Chain length 159, copies 2
């Protein structure tokens, strides 16, 4: 529980649903977000990086009726495809590639979902519950889409 250095990188952007969000940063700071017209006003202590940056750290201690609605313009995302398994997705233009996986031969859907179904987008967590991400395997591993296997680095087949 250390100020600034313990701090989770928080979300800043459009939210869906209006009302009050609350969370606790890993430093110990309680952060309040007031969401009105999709836009969040942050209230926090000056002991937390999130207060300075206008951001809201989403995690297992987040409460409130709203959810992030991120822009579809991300570079990388973490996508939870099984109970404790993740795939990393890299976007280039309108195309999406699996550039990493937590375990060899993860089964994933052939199409990326909308950005708010991602557990993380560019290092920012979007989901309240998320299991720990094991080390991402980025070489000589394969993912499954139905009955077809593809080497890491491969575009998702439904494009």
């Amino acid at each position: 529980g250390v100020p600034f250095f313990s701090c989770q990188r928080g979300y800043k952007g459009v939210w869906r649903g209006d009302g009050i969000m609350q969370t606790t940063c890993p430093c110990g700071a309680q952060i309040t977000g007031h969401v009105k017209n999709g836009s969040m006003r942050i209230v926090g202590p000056r002991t937390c990086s999130n207060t300075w940056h206008g951001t809201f750290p989403i995690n297992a201690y987040t409460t409130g009726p709203c959810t992030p609605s991120p822009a579809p313009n991300y570079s990388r995302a973490l996508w939870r495809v099984a109970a404790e398994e993740y795939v990393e997705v890299t976007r280039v233009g309108d195309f999406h590639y699996v550039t990493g996986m937590t375990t060899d031969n993860v089964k994933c859907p052939c199409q990326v979902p909308a950005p708010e179904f991602f557990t993380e987008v560019d290092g920012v967590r979007l989901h309240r519950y998320a299991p720990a991400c094991k080390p991402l395997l980025r070489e000589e591993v394969t993912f499954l889409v139905g009955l077809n296997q593809y080497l890491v680095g491969s575009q998702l087949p439904c494009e």
Copy 2:
């Protein structure tokens, strides 16, 4: 205003993934604590809450803690969030699943069901902390989209 028993949300009773202290608020106003160790949750709450008496834990937008439900495979119906604010109802018969309802006509959903823990709601029990309001489910004369193909409501999912 929250009323003992009448306001109470239907809570989860089952296996939990992760160990630690879970915390939630029932719509009746009760604060429910769950101590989770080795898959099992110990429920603490007031005599005023239907969840305390059933030994259940209501999962909602005011739930906190490091654990998630691991629901049982023998569920009948489930709510599956297939788009940002759209749901499909899934009915399970044997090892086979059917889309028996949808919140909007022509919803695009995946061709395969995920494991039960990825469902928003299983047999009237909410499993996720954040979930959008479910619109009335359309059960007659609607279709869903898997890629380019259309399927009528009641149809089995493509991949099985």
